[PDB]
Symmetry: D3
Amino acid sequence: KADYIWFNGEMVRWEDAKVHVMSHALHYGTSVFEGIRCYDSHKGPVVFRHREHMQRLHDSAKIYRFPVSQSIDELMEACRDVIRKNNLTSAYIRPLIFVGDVGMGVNPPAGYSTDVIIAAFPWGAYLGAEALEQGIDAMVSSWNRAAPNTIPTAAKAGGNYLSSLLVGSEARRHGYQEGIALDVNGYISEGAGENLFEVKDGVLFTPPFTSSALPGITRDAIIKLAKELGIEVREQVLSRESLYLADEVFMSGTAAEITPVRSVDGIQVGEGRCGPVTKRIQQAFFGLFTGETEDKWGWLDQVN
Amino acid sequence: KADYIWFNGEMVRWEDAKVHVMSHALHYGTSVFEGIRCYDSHKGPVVFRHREHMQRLHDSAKIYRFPVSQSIDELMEACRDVIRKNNLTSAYIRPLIFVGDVGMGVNPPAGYSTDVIIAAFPWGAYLGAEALEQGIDAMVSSWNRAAPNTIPTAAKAGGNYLSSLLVGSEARRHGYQEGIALDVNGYISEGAGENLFEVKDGVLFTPPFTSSALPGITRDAIIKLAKELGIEVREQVLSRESLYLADEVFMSGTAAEITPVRSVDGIQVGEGRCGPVTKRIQQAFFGLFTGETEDKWGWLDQVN
Amino acid sequence: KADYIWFNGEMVRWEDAKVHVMSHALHYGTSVFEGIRCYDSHKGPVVFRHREHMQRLHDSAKIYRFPVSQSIDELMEACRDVIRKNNLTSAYIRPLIFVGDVGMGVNPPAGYSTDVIIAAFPWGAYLGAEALEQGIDAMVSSWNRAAPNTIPTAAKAGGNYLSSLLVGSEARRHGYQEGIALDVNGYISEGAGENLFEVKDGVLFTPPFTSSALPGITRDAIIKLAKELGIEVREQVLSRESLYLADEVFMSGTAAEITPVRSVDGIQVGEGRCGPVTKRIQQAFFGLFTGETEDKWGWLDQVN
Amino acid sequence: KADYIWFNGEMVRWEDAKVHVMSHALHYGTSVFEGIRCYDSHKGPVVFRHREHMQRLHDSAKIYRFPVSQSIDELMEACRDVIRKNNLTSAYIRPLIFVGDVGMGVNPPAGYSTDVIIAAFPWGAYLGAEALEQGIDAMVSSWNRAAPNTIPTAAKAGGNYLSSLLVGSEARRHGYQEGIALDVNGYISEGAGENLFEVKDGVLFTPPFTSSALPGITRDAIIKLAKELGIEVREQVLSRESLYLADEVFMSGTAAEITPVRSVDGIQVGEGRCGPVTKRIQQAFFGLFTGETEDKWGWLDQVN
Amino acid sequence: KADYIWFNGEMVRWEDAKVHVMSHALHYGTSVFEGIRCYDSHKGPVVFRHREHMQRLHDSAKIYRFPVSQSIDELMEACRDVIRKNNLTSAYIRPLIFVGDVGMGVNPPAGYSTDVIIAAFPWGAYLGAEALEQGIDAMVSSWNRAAPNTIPTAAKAGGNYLSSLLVGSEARRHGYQEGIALDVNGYISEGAGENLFEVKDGVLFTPPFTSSALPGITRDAIIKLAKELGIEVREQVLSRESLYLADEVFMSGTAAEITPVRSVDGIQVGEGRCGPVTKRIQQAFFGLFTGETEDKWGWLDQVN
Amino acid sequence: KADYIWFNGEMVRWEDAKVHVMSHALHYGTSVFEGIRCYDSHKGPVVFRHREHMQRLHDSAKIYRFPVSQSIDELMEACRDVIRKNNLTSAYIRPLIFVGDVGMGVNPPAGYSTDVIIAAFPWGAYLGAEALEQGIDAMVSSWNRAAPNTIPTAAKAGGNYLSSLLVGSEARRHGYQEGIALDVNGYISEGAGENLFEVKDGVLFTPPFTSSALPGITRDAIIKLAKELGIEVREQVLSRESLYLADEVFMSGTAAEITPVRSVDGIQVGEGRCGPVTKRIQQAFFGLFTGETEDKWGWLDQVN
Ligand SMILES: *Cc1c(COP(=O)(O)O)cnc(C)c1O
Ligand SMILES: *Cc1c(COP(=O)(O)O)cnc(C)c1O
Ligand SMILES: *Cc1c(COP(=O)(O)O)cnc(C)c1O
Ligand SMILES: *Cc1c(COP(=O)(O)O)cnc(C)c1O
Ligand SMILES: *Cc1c(COP(=O)(O)O)cnc(C)c1O
Ligand SMILES: *Cc1c(COP(=O)(O)O)cnc(C)c1O
Ligand SMILES: O=C(O)CCCC(=O)O
Ligand SMILES: O=C(O)CCCC(=O)O
Ligand SMILES: O=C(O)CCCC(=O)O
Ligand SMILES: O=C(O)CCCC(=O)O
Ligand SMILES: O=C(O)CCCC(=O)O
Ligand SMILES: O=C(O)CCCC(=O)O
């Protein structure tokens, strides 16, 4: 929570940011959202890969044909404006584009407009306060990720998350920190809300998007970072059991950043701590906010 | 719009039924809903298969482990109460149970509670003012229905409607009234928001739930009415091309009631009009609200 | 061979029934056909389930939207005319609707018409001289039947037969009389060019159309004969290994009639000879052309 | 049309190139063919990747075990002879190997030979007059490409085209220029009769053959031209929604050459016009027949 | 454990029943086995559905072409002989047919013989001492059952059990009594070593064998018993979530007999105790050994 | 047969290496094994990729959670010790870890231990005395390889060989030397007990592990040797028909080493003999044991 929320171009106090219970999205999962982090850095408060996230917000909307009135630059300014208007230097930002109060049929009435919200607020490590340093214990879920050509997994939409709820809630109920879902083919897809990476013999592996995995922006950053670090990367389908044979394993996400996975289904991964390659990647990722890692791609948007 | 809406145990005026923009369901499709019709009949206003719908509402929630505080009878009284107060004699009732303002993680905090809304309002034939009489032109969608064990299609959840949007809007954009979706195996599943029935040589056919089709209450009713009429019924998987060979075809649902399908993909069905068996079923169905069809099951819940 | 072939309404000498090499179907498999048998019965030469076959010819053409100018009755009269013109009392008839000389694009030009042929000629036991009496040895093919929603297996089309060729030729190359193909799910579909039945504990079994099996007219007749004989019938998916556990197994088809399968993949079926249930259906079937079996369905169309 | 057609070695007047209506391929889709273009270049009339096409003709026939008596060199010489005999300097050539008048069983009799035809004639832009310059509007089909191990999609066979007909005619019926088919896994396969390419972030993408896509010779040429142009190429599975996120999309084929796709399912691709990368490949491709692009692969076969 | 084990026709003392470590089955899973119970009854010690089990032993062997020298009657006598020779009146019998010391290639040398063992010994309720009366808590496994046409699930072979080990061990590790596996389609298959039954609205449901479920003999007994009890039975595919909506649920097996399942994945089934319909079936099953249930099928083989 | 066998830490004479008939693995396929060859080389007897195999042996056990007491080096010394004692200079070593006499439930009792055996003995070319030189005739099986997430194909377990038996014995019964299996998707997986390689236009191809193929150690070696030879290698999914178009094809394995495949399904590959690239690879492979090929990886473990 924070003091204000950007709501359709106007800064509204948090408590007054409300919508009608008959809003389309509450009944039909009709919304697309983003996860963005603003970090403290040597350059001051910076939003990580800001433009890439707003571009994806638009892409998700385009896929479902949800009309978006704000341009990417407007959404970005709006985002920076809510970060300052709330006096935050570090935070998690949640943009949300949803079909609002427009009538009950699943097909929105012609000419409708979508509602847009953007809330920023501090948010701890997604998988725990000990996650980033100690790693977590994962569980392969009994629920599979959405099949191709059903609900586009390339789009980050609200409705998709019933699946992430089933996969993630199951792991927790069974005492694990996160759940790893397989696609309808029996191959590794990703975690409930984070992409999956494996390390074997010094090479980094990760499932392609066609494994029903969302095109993670953190995932993309890690691949390019790894290439810079001289680490070979292979985007390929991964068997379920490969999780038990990898030297290292970890998850990526805007919220979960880079979280080592010390075990899967009770089976220890490597030494049971953060692996050497994971450490290198992790250090290179954060060194970006210390300036130790050169921002060669222009991934740090300054809030001002 | 109506005048009041049942919101968490109390009837609030329509304009005040609002929830926070950070309500879980707006971001994660975490809601389950129902569709119910109140018919003005020879016995005055009656809710059709009222209890069955509230039970299903409970089952959907149970599947996702969404905590529900109200019992079926409680919900039933609330529904009935909503119709009276708004002074409706015929209407569409939309009960809705969703995870509200509980924080931003997809996994809700332990001990949370859901918000429950029940709105009622008049709503015309779902597929057109001519639909029920002249029948509609349907299109087979290029989008498939959710695969087994990904999202439970036996549950009527809000999140899953992203799929119905893709299926239904496509047919509509191409000039049809509704889209028919195949499951991931290539067999007929159902319409975007209606179950699919076919008639050939006097026998009634419809896919089983395992064809990724919702276990519709209108569908179950039709199967029963058909049997009472001596019409043989076969619940079995159906081929996509079977839509072109069927003597008759129609859709079913609370909103769409019993809508004949006069053409599929531009291929006329039968004589391009409502078929004889669809006719009997339909007359039998609507005969319930005139007394011509004896309510031998107890499907009419008097509003009072 | 025979003397005349009905061609677009005309009785053409067999040697003059030719088409340009640039005819569409020779390049794109764009044709639909039927197999029909005229038997020399107690009622004289009669065409078996004549209307049913011509109706299917139309259905197959309809699925592909091939324009057909002859009505089912026109087709039937032409068929009888062909038989008499060649003075045949028993024969195999091959009606064939195909896209002809209309230009090289796969999509035919608007307003085009199809060419129609009906050739009648004597044709013996499809699966061999001993087949009907002693049964054949079948092999499960390494090639699978077409998947649902690719090339509609419910339509009897020319292009379909590339599959039948692969399945059948393989079995024959390995020394068997016919090949049994499995669908893409690994379940029994049917023989390369005939439906497959199994007999277990006095109950008759056969796969539904959704197992990528063509809705055989002979298959349909068997099912009806079986029920008149007091034999329970079950149309359900069948496992590949069920072929090794069945008491009896046989194939059906217009050309193949009812052929007993004494062995599958070298494993013996029952006594390795025609089974008792098979025997009954067979006698019942052929008894239709001697009068021993009453034509309660009106399956014998008098040629005259 | 043209004056002569090479037929089993002889130069036959177009009007005399006929086959019996009882020819095997007219009933069983038993034929394999090729699309080849002769261009009027700076070197005179040349057949593009002539040997490659005839080799594929043989491969396709080999897969089905169709006996072929002409060698690749005999076929090529016949093709050049056909072109010259019709005094053509630019044309589309259609070689066709088919099972002819050999009896009605699907399995041809032992010792049979195939009939071979090579017809040459002028043929314009496969996808329209503006297609090459302005791009077309594509639609994702509701029909899927043949599954692996059913009908080998690597073989260019006549029977295959029933699928291409369904896919293409649907798009055309809905007002689009071409249809894009997905495989049975829900991933992009290709266009009804052309391979599909995507351009994203300056990188060229196209599905592998295992996505049920025919190994296009034009596709292969593009990949080679791309690498000479310094364009990175990635043959990988592509999601259906990737079509909406790609910077550019285009189709390839002998008939279709290189046709830009400006929109998919009504959604605009990039600027809605030919993309920059597409532009380069296109110029590079056509520059082969003007000399601007060096034939480093020996793709221009002199007709003489 | 007991005093003697029937080993290739000779009663050997338990401890001396050994085989060479190079026995085929230890390296290739090449064995087929059965589970049979002998009960105390009013008729004295009786083996339940004795002939049916030995017939299946033979069927399993036939499927893998393992030569079996003993006839069914010999195996039965041998079985009764080990029950008496060990002085048991109630017990679990384990027949085992395995490829022995014949060399290391997976394909056994031509002319080989299989080894056969039959051990009887008391064995408590498979799923616990409180299982049959209180019911158990089940868990849907993250491991799926074998796909059709890979390893025939209709055959009860040793090699198959690696799967039952993965499914069952997982449920236990997570604190459950048994695991329920879904097939590769996402539908209910069965428990790790027991068939699955569901009860909804007084009707009994169970997956067909094509759901990759073994043709349980206990399962078969229950179906016939239910029919006798007037209970409608439907053999059909069941969705994963149906487990959460059934009134009752239970497992069947020779070892587990009839075990109520009070919960699945933490979700209570019905009232959480043995359900009414399950009780009826259970009582009817055991009444067979008290003589209260008439043995109308001849399921009780007397040991003597 | 040899003279001694390493059995649980001590070398016992061949005739005494026996386990109880009630050993878990005999009834449940619960064992994991390896295949290793000892070559007499320019450096005397050397075990090929000794450590890699013992590691894999450990990984397979870890996948099934089979407790292993010995370390890799321990196992390695035991292997080496087995070769010396038996006085072999070249041989096939079969390590075997299995669940022994621990009770009759599929789930072993907590705290159990596995039995470990390591046998060595001379073994000729796996597919014939002419195999490696003349190549073999292969057949595509009608049985498919285990699907992902059913049985982990990344583990070399005994139970899974029921599948290799079905695949391999079929080809053998039809007169071929080995069978090639497709996965459940219809793509090439591998041979019954060998990985499958294809050569086309100088490039080496082989399916990835995700094609249900074991991650062979000979396969990995070949990929490395090929690269050292400048041969491009592509690990990708391969179509079934690609077997007929490849210039060269061969199998790989510890037992089969590098066996050329001269024909598939009766269709000759290349010139019907070992192909040029297979030749180079092979010469490179066997060159390791003469010193001609520099062991640049450390694949030869001296027996001493
Ligand atoms: C948001 C999300 C991720 C992480 O992607 P980032 O762009 O790196 O935040 C991963 N998986 C799913 C399903 C997601 O919704
Ligand atoms: C609500 C719904 C139906 C219709 O079910 P009824 O219970 O008859 O209203 C059909 N299909 C889907 C996908 C639905 O959501
Ligand atoms: C024609 C055909 C049959 C047989 O059907 P009938 O109507 O009985 O002749 C069976 N299978 C296939 C694939 C066929 O084409
Ligand atoms: C012929 C064909 C193509 C195009 O291949 P080219 O060799 O480039 O002509 C593409 N797809 C299909 C289905 C085809 O038959
Ligand atoms: C043995 C077994 C059963 C139970 O079958 P019964 O004949 O009733 O003993 C169920 N599932 C599997 C996988 C089995 O092996
Ligand atoms: C053992 C085996 C191989 C060969 O692997 P290598 O490590 O090279 O010996 C190939 N396929 C299967 C199924 C195997 O079991
Ligand atoms: O990582 C993110 O930014 C979004 C996923 C986390 C969640 O909202 O559950
Ligand atoms: O709101 C919709 O679009 C679906 C309504 C479904 C029903 O209640 O029948
Ligand atoms: O022509 C064939 O090869 C099969 C025809 C099938 C039939 O007519 O029954
Ligand atoms: O004939 C067609 O319709 C397509 C031919 C494809 C080609 O030759 O490129
Ligand atoms: O029920 C049976 O008879 C066999 C399965 C139990 C087991 O051996 O694990
Ligand atoms: O024993 C077999 O039949 C397989 C041997 C596999 C290998 O070690 O290469």
